[PDB]
Design a binder for this molecule. Structure first.
Ligand SMILES: O=c1[nH]c2cnc3ccc(Cl)cc3c2[nH]c1=O
Ligand code: NI
Length: 341
């Protein structure tokens, strides 16, 4: 059954709640982004209105085959009226098409649902500016001070320089990047751009990227693996066995594999800066784990919440254990006491 933190009180709206059958009283289902945990349940048989970004709408229609009559894409940063309620979609700085949702309840209550997001000071100059928010449904994925990682800029700079140096030293090296889902596309796009190559990938992954409204994708992606020296593979294949098997299939065109595993936070980030990251190596294969996060760090999350000054916070991640809930409520009170709201 649909949990409480996916319900918007005072409306007939749910958020990322497609795996609970027909939710009681839901006139419109909002989808924050196209990640499996959040769209779980949608298919060509869904017969209720889905509200989402245009990019998420492209993915629902092409990847899940949802009928167009049930897809309601909304522009970003635009006050829209949905079933008599004013709503705004804001960029969540997560994966392509990911949004936060502002709900203007009829009784005057204002609710911000972040979906999944990586907080950034640029959000302090969105439509949230000088907007009273009474309730915040917060992506609390990394809501603990030990969760530190670099900016996406620094990680991409490390990936670009690492890939460019390796391929310049060995023109016969292949660069491989692992992928879970949508998101973190900048990793393989920036590597291919510095190497003068297109990104080769499966037809299914190619189809997914064609839905993302990225300007000039036909410039950087392709399904012709032989024409590419930057290949996309499923994240599970980014291991020594999986990469050895892939290299045998390249027809003797390459004698070395440089592989990147885009991860979230890992325990290595407690001791190792991005500049000092080193790979796992076995023979002619090296694997880099790079902390490219599309979720807020603790400090980014704290800064955003202390700026927004919500009257109530409802976590949407790490809600399953009393220890996590107690830990998160303690930090919420700390932020409130320090900031003074
Ligand atoms: O949509 C999303 N789903 C999920 C699901 N499981 C996860 C497990 C671990 C970490 Cl670090 C991130 C996760 C995640 N992040 C997303 O953005
Ligand atoms: Ni997500």
């Amino acid at each position: 059954t649909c949990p409480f933190y996916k319900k918007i009180p005072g409306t007939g709206f749910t958020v990322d709640a497609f795996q609970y059958g027909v939710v009681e009283g839901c006139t419109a289902y909002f989808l924050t982004h196209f990640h499996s945990d959040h769209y779980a349940g949608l298919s060509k048989h869904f017969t209720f209105p889905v509200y989402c970004s245009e990019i998420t709408g492209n993915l629902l229609k092409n990847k899940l085959h949802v009928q167009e009559q049930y897809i309601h894409p909304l522009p970003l940063d635009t006050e829209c009226i949905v079933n008599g309620v004013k709503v705004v979609l804001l960029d969540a700085n997560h994966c392509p098409g990911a949004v936060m949702i502002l709900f203007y309840l009829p009784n005057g209550t204002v609710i911000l649902h972040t979906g999944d997001f990586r907080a950034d000071p640029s959000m302090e100059r969105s439509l949230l500016a000088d907007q009273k928010v009474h309730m915040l449904y917060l992506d609390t994925t990394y809501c603990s001070p030990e969760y530190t990682f670099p900016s996406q800029q620094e990680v991409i700079r490390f990936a670009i320089n690492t890939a460019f140096e390796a391929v310049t030293l060995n023109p016969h090296a292949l660069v491989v990047c692992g992928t879970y889902s949508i998101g973190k596309e900048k990793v393989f796009l920036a590597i291919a751009d510095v190497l003068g190559s297109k990104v080769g990938m499966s037809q299914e992954k190619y189809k997914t990227l064609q839905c993302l409204n990225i300007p000039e994708i036909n410039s950087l992606i392709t399904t012709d693996m032989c024409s590419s020296l930057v290949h996309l593979l499923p994240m599970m294949q980014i291991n020594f066995k999986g990469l050895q098997s892939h290299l045998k299939k390249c027809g003797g065109k390459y004698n070395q594999i440089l592989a990147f595993r885009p991860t979230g936070w890992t325990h290595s980030n407690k001791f190792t800066r991005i500049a000092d990251v080193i790979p796992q190596t076995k023979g002619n294969i090296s694997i880099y784990g790079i902390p490219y996060s599309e979720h807020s760090s603790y400090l980014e999350m704290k800064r955003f919440v202390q700026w927004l000054k919500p009257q109530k916070i409802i976590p949407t991640v790490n809600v399953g254990t009393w220890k996590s809930r107690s830990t998160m409520e303690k930090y919420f009170r700390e932020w409130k006491l320090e900031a003074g709201y």
